[PDB]
Amino acid sequence: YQLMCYYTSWAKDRPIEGSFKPGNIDPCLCTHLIYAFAGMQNNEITYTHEQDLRDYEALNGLKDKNTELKTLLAIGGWKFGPAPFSAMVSTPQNRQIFIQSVIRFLRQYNFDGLNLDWQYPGSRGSPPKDKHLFSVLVKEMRKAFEEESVEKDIPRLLLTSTGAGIIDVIKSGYKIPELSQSLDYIQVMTYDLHDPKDGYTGENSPLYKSPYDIGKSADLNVDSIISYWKDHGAASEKLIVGFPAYGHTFILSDPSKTGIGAPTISTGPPGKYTDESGLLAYYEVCTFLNEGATEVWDAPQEVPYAYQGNEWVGYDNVRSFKLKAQWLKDNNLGGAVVWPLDMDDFSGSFCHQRHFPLTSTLKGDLNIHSASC
Protein backbone atom coordinates (compact mmCIF):
# COMPACT_ATOMS: atom_id res chain seq x y z
CA TYR A 1 0.00 0.00 0.00
CA GLN A 2 0.96 3.68 -0.35
CA LEU A 3 0.80 6.29 2.42
CA MET A 4 0.89 9.79 0.91
CA CYS A 5 1.15 12.89 3.12
CA TYR A 6 0.46 16.53 2.32
CA TYR A 7 2.73 19.33 3.46
CA THR A 8 1.05 22.76 3.05
CA SER A 9 3.21 25.84 2.42
CA TRP A 10 1.16 27.98 4.82
CA ALA A 11 1.59 25.65 7.90
CA LYS A 12 4.89 27.32 8.77
CA ASP A 13 3.11 30.72 9.15
CA ARG A 14 0.88 29.54 12.03
CA PRO A 15 1.71 30.48 15.69
CA ILE A 16 5.11 28.83 16.41
CA GLU A 17 3.99 25.81 18.54
CA GLY A 18 1.40 24.95 15.83
CA SER A 19 3.78 25.80 12.91
CA PHE A 20 5.24 23.04 10.79
CA LYS A 21 8.25 22.97 8.44
CA PRO A 22 9.46 20.21 6.02
CA GLY A 23 12.29 19.40 8.48
CA ASN A 24 9.74 18.42 11.15
CA ILE A 25 8.65 15.52 8.80
CA ASP A 26 9.77 12.06 9.81
CA PRO A 27 11.33 10.76 6.52
CA CYS A 28 10.21 7.15 7.29
CA LEU A 29 6.55 7.94 8.03
CA CYS A 30 5.13 8.16 4.48
CA THR A 31 5.81 6.63 1.03
CA HIS A 32 5.04 10.00 -0.73
CA LEU A 33 5.14 13.62 0.37
CA ILE A 34 2.98 16.09 -1.56
CA TYR A 35 3.82 19.79 -1.54
CA ALA A 36 0.72 22.03 -1.64
CA PHE A 37 0.94 24.15 -3.82
CA ALA A 38 2.72 25.29 -6.97
CA GLY A 39 1.28 28.24 -8.91
CA MET A 40 0.76 29.02 -12.58
CA GLN A 41 1.70 31.98 -14.79
CA ASN A 42 1.71 32.25 -18.62
CA ASN A 43 0.40 28.59 -18.76
CA GLU A 44 3.53 27.40 -16.93
CA ILE A 45 3.96 25.85 -13.53
CA THR A 46 5.89 28.09 -11.10
CA TYR A 47 6.52 28.77 -7.39
CA THR A 48 4.02 31.01 -5.45
CA HIS A 49 6.67 32.69 -3.21
CA GLU A 50 10.52 32.98 -2.99
CA GLN A 51 10.44 30.96 0.28
CA ASP A 52 8.90 27.98 -1.59
CA LEU A 53 12.32 27.19 -3.16
CA ARG A 54 13.85 26.70 0.35
CA ASP A 55 10.80 24.52 1.22
CA TYR A 56 11.34 22.36 -1.90
CA GLU A 57 15.03 21.89 -0.90
CA ALA A 58 14.13 20.91 2.71
CA LEU A 59 11.30 18.57 1.59
CA ASN A 60 13.28 16.85 -1.21
CA GLY A 61 16.33 16.71 1.13
CA LEU A 62 14.33 14.16 3.25
CA LYS A 63 14.96 11.66 0.38
CA ASP A 64 18.63 11.50 1.55
CA LYS A 65 17.18 9.97 4.81
CA ASN A 66 14.76 7.60 3.01
CA THR A 67 15.98 6.72 -0.50
CA GLU A 68 12.60 5.09 -1.40
CA LEU A 69 10.58 8.21 -0.46
CA LYS A 70 8.91 9.99 -3.37
CA THR A 71 7.88 13.63 -3.55
CA LEU A 72 5.08 15.19 -5.62
CA LEU A 73 4.30 18.82 -6.35
CA ALA A 74 0.56 19.66 -6.31
CA ILE A 75 -0.92 22.42 -8.48
CA GLY A 76 -4.41 23.82 -7.91
CA GLY A 77 -6.69 23.34 -4.93
CA TRP A 78 -10.05 24.86 -3.93
CA LYS A 79 -8.90 28.49 -3.50
CA PHE A 80 -7.02 28.47 -6.86
CA GLY A 81 -10.26 27.41 -8.60
CA PRO A 82 -10.95 26.32 -12.15
CA ALA A 83 -10.23 29.38 -14.36
CA PRO A 84 -6.36 28.98 -14.81
CA PHE A 85 -6.87 25.31 -15.78
CA SER A 86 -9.73 26.03 -18.21
CA ALA A 87 -7.51 28.54 -20.03
CA MET A 88 -4.46 26.23 -20.03
CA VAL A 89 -6.28 23.19 -21.48
CA SER A 90 -8.17 25.27 -24.11
CA THR A 91 -5.50 24.93 -26.86
CA PRO A 92 -2.79 22.37 -27.82
CA GLN A 93 -0.14 25.20 -27.62
CA ASN A 94 -1.17 26.08 -24.03
CA ARG A 95 -1.11 22.42 -22.99
CA GLN A 96 2.38 21.92 -24.57
CA ILE A 97 3.73 25.05 -22.79
CA PHE A 98 2.39 23.67 -19.50
CA ILE A 99 3.68 20.09 -19.94
CA GLN A 100 7.18 21.27 -20.97
CA SER A 101 7.27 23.68 -17.97
CA VAL A 102 6.30 20.80 -15.60
CA ILE A 103 9.07 18.45 -16.82
CA ARG A 104 11.69 21.23 -16.45
CA PHE A 105 10.37 22.35 -13.03
CA LEU A 106 10.07 18.91 -11.42
CA ARG A 107 13.53 17.87 -12.66
CA GLN A 108 15.19 21.13 -11.54
CA TYR A 109 13.82 20.92 -7.99
CA ASN A 110 14.13 17.10 -7.59
CA PHE A 111 10.40 16.20 -7.42
CA ASP A 112 9.34 12.67 -8.46
CA GLY A 113 6.05 13.72 -10.00
CA LEU A 114 3.04 16.04 -10.33
CA ASN A 115 -0.32 16.04 -8.58
CA LEU A 116 -3.03 17.81 -10.59
CA ASP A 117 -5.68 19.26 -8.30
CA TRP A 118 -8.17 21.09 -10.51
CA GLN A 119 -11.26 22.00 -8.42
CA TYR A 120 -13.05 21.26 -10.72
CA PRO A 121 -13.34 20.52 -14.45
CA GLY A 122 -17.00 20.89 -15.47
CA SER A 123 -18.18 22.84 -12.40
CA ARG A 124 -17.58 26.14 -10.52
CA GLY A 125 -17.63 27.98 -13.89
CA SER A 126 -15.54 25.44 -15.83
CA PRO A 127 -17.64 24.51 -18.94
CA PRO A 128 -18.76 20.92 -19.82
CA LYS A 129 -16.03 20.67 -22.53
CA ASP A 130 -13.39 20.70 -19.72
CA LYS A 131 -14.36 17.12 -18.77
CA HIS A 132 -13.01 16.02 -22.22
CA LEU A 133 -10.09 18.54 -22.21
CA PHE A 134 -8.89 17.48 -18.77
CA SER A 135 -8.72 13.88 -20.01
CA VAL A 136 -6.75 15.09 -23.10
CA LEU A 137 -4.28 17.02 -20.87
CA VAL A 138 -3.72 13.96 -18.61
CA LYS A 139 -3.10 11.66 -21.61
CA GLU A 140 -0.65 14.19 -23.22
CA MET A 141 1.19 14.71 -19.88
CA ARG A 142 1.54 10.88 -19.32
CA LYS A 143 2.89 10.49 -22.92
CA ALA A 144 5.41 13.35 -22.44
CA PHE A 145 6.62 11.84 -19.12
CA GLU A 146 7.10 8.40 -20.79
CA GLU A 147 9.04 10.08 -23.66
CA GLU A 148 11.32 12.02 -21.30
CA SER A 149 12.05 8.83 -19.25
CA VAL A 150 13.20 6.96 -22.41
CA GLU A 151 15.18 9.93 -23.82
CA LYS A 152 17.05 10.61 -20.49
CA ASP A 153 17.30 6.93 -19.26
CA ILE A 154 15.86 7.88 -15.83
CA PRO A 155 12.74 6.70 -13.92
CA ARG A 156 9.53 8.24 -15.27
CA LEU A 157 7.93 11.13 -13.43
CA LEU A 158 4.71 10.14 -11.58
CA LEU A 159 1.34 11.64 -12.55
CA THR A 160 -1.49 11.79 -10.03
CA SER A 161 -4.76 13.71 -9.79
CA THR A 162 -7.22 14.48 -7.04
CA GLY A 163 -10.74 13.12 -7.64
CA ALA A 164 -13.96 14.74 -6.34
CA GLY A 165 -15.90 13.12 -3.49
CA ILE A 166 -19.25 14.74 -4.46
CA ILE A 167 -21.13 12.47 -6.91
CA ASP A 168 -22.59 15.32 -9.08
CA VAL A 169 -19.06 16.85 -9.37
CA ILE A 170 -17.57 13.46 -10.41
CA LYS A 171 -20.29 13.10 -13.12
CA SER A 172 -19.62 16.52 -14.63
CA GLY A 173 -15.85 16.52 -14.48
CA TYR A 174 -14.19 13.08 -14.77
CA LYS A 175 -13.86 10.59 -17.69
CA ILE A 176 -13.07 7.84 -15.15
CA PRO A 177 -11.97 4.93 -17.42
CA GLU A 178 -9.64 7.17 -19.51
CA LEU A 179 -8.23 8.98 -16.45
CA SER A 180 -7.57 5.63 -14.68
CA GLN A 181 -5.60 4.45 -17.79
CA SER A 182 -3.16 7.40 -17.80
CA LEU A 183 -2.77 8.34 -14.13
CA ASP A 184 -0.51 6.49 -11.68
CA TYR A 185 -2.94 7.34 -8.82
CA ILE A 186 -6.28 9.06 -8.17
CA GLN A 187 -6.41 10.73 -4.72
CA VAL A 188 -10.09 10.64 -3.80
CA MET A 189 -11.24 13.60 -1.74
CA THR A 190 -13.27 11.62 0.78
CA TYR A 191 -13.57 14.56 3.19
CA ASP A 192 -15.41 17.91 3.59
CA LEU A 193 -18.61 15.69 3.48
CA HIS A 194 -20.23 17.62 6.39
CA ASP A 195 -22.71 19.45 4.07
CA PRO A 196 -22.56 22.79 5.98
CA LYS A 197 -25.48 24.34 4.01
CA ASP A 198 -27.88 21.56 5.14
CA GLY A 199 -28.64 23.20 8.51
CA TYR A 200 -27.72 20.05 10.47
CA THR A 201 -24.57 18.63 12.06
CA GLY A 202 -22.69 16.32 9.71
CA GLU A 203 -19.45 14.34 9.86
CA ASN A 204 -16.40 15.47 7.84
CA SER A 205 -15.42 11.97 6.66
CA PRO A 206 -17.80 9.16 7.78
CA LEU A 207 -16.94 5.63 6.66
CA TYR A 208 -20.66 4.78 6.21
CA LYS A 209 -23.90 6.67 5.88
CA SER A 210 -25.92 7.73 8.92
CA PRO A 211 -29.35 6.00 9.37
CA TYR A 212 -30.62 9.67 9.25
CA ASP A 213 -29.18 10.38 5.75
CA ILE A 214 -31.64 10.62 2.87
CA GLY A 215 -31.20 11.07 -0.88
CA LYS A 216 -27.80 12.45 -1.95
CA SER A 217 -26.78 12.77 1.73
CA ALA A 218 -26.63 8.94 1.83
CA ASP A 219 -23.68 9.10 -0.62
CA LEU A 220 -21.58 11.51 1.57
CA ASN A 221 -19.38 8.75 3.00
CA VAL A 222 -16.13 6.92 2.16
CA ASP A 223 -17.76 3.60 1.22
CA SER A 224 -20.30 5.15 -1.20
CA ILE A 225 -17.75 7.44 -2.85
CA ILE A 226 -15.10 4.78 -3.44
CA SER A 227 -17.84 2.38 -4.64
CA TYR A 228 -18.95 4.98 -7.19
CA TRP A 229 -15.37 5.45 -8.56
CA LYS A 230 -14.89 1.65 -8.85
CA ASP A 231 -18.35 1.02 -10.36
CA HIS A 232 -17.59 3.65 -13.05
CA GLY A 233 -14.23 2.14 -14.04
CA ALA A 234 -11.37 3.33 -11.77
CA ALA A 235 -8.67 0.76 -10.93
CA SER A 236 -8.88 -0.25 -7.25
CA GLU A 237 -5.04 -0.38 -6.99
CA LYS A 238 -4.79 3.27 -8.25
CA LEU A 239 -7.35 4.66 -5.77
CA ILE A 240 -5.84 6.49 -2.78
CA VAL A 241 -8.41 7.22 -0.07
CA GLY A 242 -8.39 10.68 1.54
CA PHE A 243 -7.90 10.63 5.34
CA PRO A 244 -8.45 14.08 6.92
CA ALA A 245 -6.30 15.18 9.90
CA TYR A 246 -9.00 17.72 10.99
CA GLY A 247 -12.71 18.05 11.65
CA HIS A 248 -15.50 20.53 10.92
CA THR A 249 -17.37 22.58 13.52
CA PHE A 250 -20.90 23.88 13.95
CA ILE A 251 -22.96 25.98 16.34
CA LEU A 252 -25.95 24.02 17.64
CA SER A 253 -29.42 25.60 17.62
CA ASP A 254 -30.22 23.79 20.90
CA PRO A 255 -27.49 22.62 23.42
CA SER A 256 -29.91 19.73 24.33
CA LYS A 257 -29.77 18.39 20.68
CA THR A 258 -26.18 17.22 20.28
CA GLY A 259 -26.18 14.24 17.94
CA ILE A 260 -25.44 13.76 14.26
CA GLY A 261 -28.25 15.48 12.35
CA ALA A 262 -28.87 18.07 15.15
CA PRO A 263 -30.07 21.51 13.96
CA THR A 264 -27.34 24.15 13.48
CA ILE A 265 -27.00 27.94 13.25
CA SER A 266 -23.61 28.46 11.55
CA THR A 267 -20.04 27.16 11.28
CA GLY A 268 -18.06 27.20 14.56
CA PRO A 269 -15.42 29.82 15.44
CA PRO A 270 -11.82 29.46 14.12
CA GLY A 271 -9.19 27.61 16.13
CA LYS A 272 -6.22 29.46 17.72
CA TYR A 273 -3.68 27.88 15.32
CA THR A 274 -5.47 27.06 12.05
CA ASP A 275 -7.60 30.25 12.01
CA GLU A 276 -10.32 28.91 9.66
CA SER A 277 -14.04 29.28 10.46
CA GLY A 278 -15.66 25.82 10.61
CA LEU A 279 -12.42 23.81 10.86
CA LEU A 280 -10.18 22.45 13.65
CA ALA A 281 -6.92 20.55 13.24
CA TYR A 282 -6.85 17.14 15.00
CA TYR A 283 -4.37 18.67 17.49
CA GLU A 284 -6.92 21.50 18.19
CA VAL A 285 -9.71 18.92 18.70
CA CYS A 286 -7.41 17.35 21.33
CA THR A 287 -7.35 20.73 23.17
CA PHE A 288 -11.18 20.91 22.90
CA LEU A 289 -11.45 17.42 24.55
CA ASN A 290 -8.72 18.16 27.14
CA GLU A 291 -10.63 21.33 28.18
CA GLY A 292 -13.94 19.52 28.75
CA ALA A 293 -15.84 18.65 25.56
CA THR A 294 -18.03 15.50 25.73
CA GLU A 295 -16.61 12.86 23.34
CA VAL A 296 -19.02 10.51 21.49
CA TRP A 297 -18.39 7.58 19.17
CA ASP A 298 -20.92 7.14 16.35
CA ALA A 299 -20.80 3.46 15.36
CA PRO A 300 -23.14 3.74 12.29
CA GLN A 301 -20.65 6.16 10.65
CA GLU A 302 -17.55 4.85 12.52
CA VAL A 303 -16.33 8.29 13.42
CA PRO A 304 -16.25 10.43 16.60
CA TYR A 305 -17.84 13.77 17.43
CA ALA A 306 -17.54 16.10 20.43
CA TYR A 307 -19.50 18.94 21.93
CA GLN A 308 -19.41 21.62 24.61
CA GLY A 309 -22.22 24.11 25.14
CA ASN A 310 -23.43 25.03 21.63
CA GLU A 311 -20.10 24.05 19.95
CA TRP A 312 -20.00 20.73 18.03
CA VAL A 313 -17.16 19.08 16.02
CA GLY A 314 -17.17 16.03 13.72
CA TYR A 315 -13.67 14.64 13.17
CA ASP A 316 -11.34 11.61 12.86
CA ASN A 317 -9.30 9.91 15.58
CA VAL A 318 -7.01 6.86 15.96
CA ARG A 319 -10.02 4.48 16.13
CA SER A 320 -11.70 5.84 12.99
CA PHE A 321 -8.36 5.76 11.09
CA LYS A 322 -7.83 2.12 12.20
CA LEU A 323 -11.34 1.06 11.05
CA LYS A 324 -10.95 2.89 7.74
CA ALA A 325 -7.48 1.32 7.19
CA GLN A 326 -9.01 -2.19 7.71
CA TRP A 327 -11.81 -1.31 5.23
CA LEU A 328 -9.17 -0.04 2.71
CA LYS A 329 -7.25 -3.34 2.88
CA ASP A 330 -10.46 -5.43 2.69
CA ASN A 331 -11.40 -3.54 -0.52
CA ASN A 332 -7.96 -3.93 -2.18
CA LEU A 333 -7.37 -0.20 -2.52
CA GLY A 334 -4.07 1.45 -3.38
CA GLY A 335 -3.52 3.23 -0.08
CA ALA A 336 -4.24 6.41 1.84
CA VAL A 337 -3.43 10.13 1.68
CA VAL A 338 -3.31 12.24 4.85
CA TRP A 339 -4.74 15.71 4.30
CA PRO A 340 -2.87 17.71 5.64
CA LEU A 341 0.03 16.10 7.62
CA ASP A 342 0.61 19.49 9.36
CA MET A 343 -2.74 19.14 11.28
CA ASP A 344 -1.87 15.73 12.83
CA ASP A 345 -0.17 16.08 16.31
CA PHE A 346 3.36 16.34 14.87
CA SER A 347 4.92 17.42 18.22
CA GLY A 348 2.95 14.98 20.42
CA SER A 349 2.29 17.91 22.83
CA PHE A 350 -1.46 18.32 22.19
CA CYS A 351 -2.87 14.75 22.18
CA HIS A 352 -0.33 12.82 24.35
CA GLN A 353 -0.34 9.99 21.76
CA ARG A 354 3.38 10.41 20.66
CA HIS A 355 4.48 12.02 17.32
CA PHE A 356 1.98 11.99 14.39
CA PRO A 357 -0.63 9.69 16.09
CA LEU A 358 -2.98 9.65 13.08
CA THR A 359 -0.38 9.11 10.36
CA SER A 360 1.64 6.61 12.49
CA THR A 361 -1.61 4.57 12.87
CA LEU A 362 -1.80 4.24 9.06
CA LYS A 363 1.94 3.51 8.74
CA GLY A 364 1.51 0.47 11.02
CA ASP A 365 -1.89 -0.73 9.77
CA LEU A 366 -0.90 -0.40 6.08
CA ASN A 367 2.43 -2.21 6.74
CA ILE A 368 4.48 0.67 5.29
CA HIS A 369 8.12 -0.42 4.85
CA SER A 370 11.19 1.01 3.17
CA ALA A 371 14.55 -0.85 3.09
CA SER A 372 16.29 2.50 3.85
CA CYS A 373 14.16 2.75 7.07
Numbering used by the authors: 1 to 373
Which text from the study accompanies this structure?
Although mice do not encode Gal10 in their genome, they do form pseudo-CLCs, made from the chitinase-like proteins Ym1 and/or Ym2, encoded by Chil3 and Chil4 and made by myeloid and epithelial cells respectively. Ym1 (encoded by the Chil3 gene) and Ym2 (encoded by the Chil4 gene) are CLPs belonging to the glycoside hydrolase family 18 (GH18) and are unique to mice, with no known human orthologues. However, Ym1 is mainly expressed by macrophages, neutrophils and a subset of circulating pro-repair monocytes, while Ym2 is produced by lung epithelial cells, which could have discrete context dependent benefits. Ym1 and Ym2 are among the most strongly induced proteins in the airways of mice after allergen exposure and both proteins readily form pseudo-CLCs in vivo.
